[PDB]
Amino acid sequence: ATQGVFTLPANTRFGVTAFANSSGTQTVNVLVNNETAATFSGQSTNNAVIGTQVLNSGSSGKVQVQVSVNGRPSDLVSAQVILTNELNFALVGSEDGTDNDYNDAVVVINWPLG
């Protein structure tokens, strides 16, 4: 199944933050309605924040997270969770190798903001 794709409410500001846990340099691209809106890159085996940014979901609300390492797409896992019918997390893990820890880049999207 497709992973890393989320439909947010339209025209909503959201946070996106990426952490790294891999010897490979992670590149995280965040697309809004299929256009790149943010790109983070970095390397850590200790959960360092490689980027954090506030974006806008636009008219469609479609947000996609893509992760690659040296140009090769990582395998993604994702889900969205809503607490008290208000607080939203869109969660992504990614795997660049064979150990299947799925933490090589971890991406968290949260809304609402403010």
Catalog residues that contact ligand ZDC under the rule CB under 6 A: 21-24, 45, 96-97, 99, 101, 104
Report the distance separating Cα 95 and Cα 52, nearest Å. Answer: 20
Report the distance separating Cα 89 and Cα 100, nearest Å. Answer: 22
CB of 76 to Ca ion, least distance (A): 12
Q: Under 8 Å CB-to-CB from 35, ≥6 apart: which residues?
A: none
- Residue 22 within binding range of Ca ion, rule CB under 5 A: yes
Instruction: Mark the segment that binds Ca ion (CB under 5 A) among 8-16, 57-65, 66-74, 101-109.
Output: 101-109
**Which residues pair with residue 112 across a beta bridge?**
none
| Residues 21 and 45 sit within 8 Å (Cβ to Cβ) | yes
* Chosen from Ca ion, ligand ZDC, none, partner binding at 24 (C-beta under 5 to 8 Å by type): ligand ZDC
Give the interface with Ca ion as residue ranges (CB under 5 A): 21-22, 95, 97, 99, 101, 103-104
